[PDB]
Amino acid sequence: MTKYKYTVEESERFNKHGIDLTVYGQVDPSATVVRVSVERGHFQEFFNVRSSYTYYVVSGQGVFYLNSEAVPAGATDLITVPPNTRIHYFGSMEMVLTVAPAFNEQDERHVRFISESESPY
Template sequence: MTKNNSKAVRDLIPEILKLSGRECMIRELSDSSFLPELENKLEEELQEYLESKELEELADLLEVIYRIAELRGSSKAELETIRQRKKHEKGGFEKNLLLVSSLKESSHPELCSAGSTESKHVVFKPEDAAVIEKKGVKMRIYTTKAESENAGVLYQETQKGHTEEFLHEKSDFIYYILEGSGVWIVEDREFEAQAGDVVVVPAGKRFWFRGNLKQVCITAPAWEEQYERHIRDLEL
């Protein structure tokens, strides 16, 4: 029985093999078929890093991770936003902490009270926010969820509008327009708005907007990606 040695490879590998005089057989898969192959590749790249500890292997891991995110409908920017949010909520790995044991019910809360006497984060600076561009809108996302699960805050700028109709199953979207004007299309109905106006889109309502705008968007409760539903992409 012939062993199956097929595996996901980088886009230029077939050309590189051909130039070196080596023959190869290549199949081009659909996104859905390629995804499990790429996830197998992730395991392979991780093992190679664990064996070599080389920086190049870490770079290979990142390349595979970014493509997996794309195939699952996200982008590098969205992945980075989630990474920064989780780092703000739970911290990174800079302190080299090792959890030796975990108490199911802490009758002695002082055993895990490092930093518990510190005050919560109150002021959030622009330089600490995650900055991404998504669907025609530049956004500055303030990672406030750890302090306030009841609401999230974004600053947005767009010259044309949001090129996606979507809905959020859990959060209301409340926009305060700082500059400019636009039109919100909510459940196929159009509503004009301008600087000084507030636009409220309740949870579960599909919507998008167009216009030249600078605005603050508050989501209540705080936005969570898992509850967002894509309807369709738009051209403005």
């Protein structure tokens, strides 16, 4: 009766601000986990008032901007962003993202769009 396994085939998959998201559909108040694929960048800056965003970099190389501070990131690195921190990133990377407490779109806040020319990837 209990669903333990979620697959890519059954996931919701869409593009948002230059990234390709795989949202498995996990429901759990403690955290939710998604895949993020980025070719050149996440061309938007945002923050989340409630949840920490933890990015594990599966492959590739990029750079996060966290409250405007550059944080280089590469394969096998863990990037740990606390709540209420402005986020954007450039790069060519495959990542696994944890949002803890569970992602709620109501908690996210748009700061600005970013020109695609700003990414050096």
